Structures are given as C-alpha cells and as structure tokens.
C-alpha cells in the first residue's frame, strides 16, 4: 500500500524563474513563506499556500 | 669512453683528417 500511495510531487510555485534558481531562503518564523532568487537577477517572495 | 669516442665529429677532427689526407 505504501508503494501505490507514493505520490510525492504536489506542485510547483507559480511559473518559476526566467533563469535557473540558485538561492532559496525559508522564513524560519512563518510556515508558508519563501524567498527565491535566480541568475537573472530577479528575487521573488512566495506564498506556498 | 674509448668505445663511445668518435673519430670524425668535431671541426678539429676533420681538419686533422684533412691534414693526413694530403
């Protein structure tokens, strides 16, 4: 039963970054918040909920 | 050293051979 119920992927955040993601930072005080940055120079703040 | 020596290699040697040739 463990094998047939193994469905780990839940989803992706938004449309992702234009270029590869090389920096991820979690908010240690908030459960659903995240920060990511890419080689494009762009940084985003997410609502994982 | 005697077996590894060359009779005709240096400029002085061939001149010596030329001297004896004539």
């Amino acid at each position: 039963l463990e094998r047939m119920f193994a469905k780990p992927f839940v989803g992706q955040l938004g449309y992702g970054h234009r270029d590869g993601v090389y920096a991820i930072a979690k908010n240690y005080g908030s459960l659903n918040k995240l920060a990511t940055g890419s080689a494009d120079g762009v940084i985003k703040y997410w609502n994982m909920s | 050293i005697d077996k590894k020596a060359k009779k005709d290699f240096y400029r002085f040697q061939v001149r010596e051979r030329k001297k004896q040739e004539i």
Partner: protein, 141 residues
C-alpha cells in the same frame, strides 16, 4: 605520434620543476667546464658527455649547474661539430644500410627502411639549411 611508424609511445625525461642547482652539489662550476672540454677533446659527443657527467659526477643538468648548455660551453672553447649531432647519426645509419644493401641485394626490407632514413635526412637537412646552421649549398651524398 611517431613519424614513419604507428607507435604512440610517450617515454621521455621529466625535467624537474626547480631550475637551481641541487643543494648537495658542492663542486665548482669551472671544474665542470674543464671536464666537458676534456671529454669533447677525447671525441665524445654532447649527448654522451651529459650521460657521463650525470651518471658519475652528479651533474644533474649542465645548464642548471653551469648556466650554459653543453653545446654553448664547447663552442665557447673552440669545440664545435661539422654538422648537428642528430643529423650526424642519421647519415651514419644511412651509410650502414647502403653498405648492407651492397652485399645483400635481395633485402627489400632494407630498401624500404633506407627510404625512411633518407626522408628523415631531407626533412632535417632542410631545417638546418633554413636556420643557416648548415651552408645553403650542402646536399646529402
């Protein structure tokens, strides 16, 4: 990598990184020069001189110990060959094969090897003629 052969060997000497004389070497530079002159007077070629000094006299490299190559040391003292040492041996080998082909006219293998040797002489002779080490009129045999 061999020209005129299919071998790809890489056997060679690996000159040490440091270019100063060994610490344990405690002989005067002038003494090494006199030893080089003596051996050249006896008839030894520059390649053979380096072997004797390196094997028995601790001279790791003539340039490192004395600051000048064996060829330049000898030329400074009046000792210089007719023709470059590598060309000297190629010609001698060609002579020996030609002598053998004289007695044995059925040795087609020796005929093939002679072509390779004479070809090496022409390429090597042409280089030395370009650099002016060899007089322009010089021709093999």
């Amino acid at each position: 990598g061999r020209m005129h052969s299919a071998g790809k060997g890489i056997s060679s000497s690996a000159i040490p990184y440091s270019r100063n004389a060994p610490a344990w070497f405690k002989l005067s530079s002038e003494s090494v020069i006199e030893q080089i002159v003596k051996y050249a007077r006896k008839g030894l070629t520059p390649s053979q001189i380096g072997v004797l000094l390196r094997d028995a006299h601790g001279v790791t490299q003539a340039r490192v110990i004395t600051g000048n190559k064996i060829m330049r040391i000898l030329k400074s003292n009046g000792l210089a060959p007719e023709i470059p040492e590598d060309l000297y041996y190629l010609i001698k080998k060609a002579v020996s094969v030609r002598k053998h082909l004289e007695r044995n006219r059925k040795d087609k293998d020796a005929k093939f090897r002679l072509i390779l040797i004479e070809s090496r002489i022409h390429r090597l002779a042409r280089y030395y003629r370009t650099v002016a080490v060899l007089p322009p009129n010089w021709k093999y045999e």
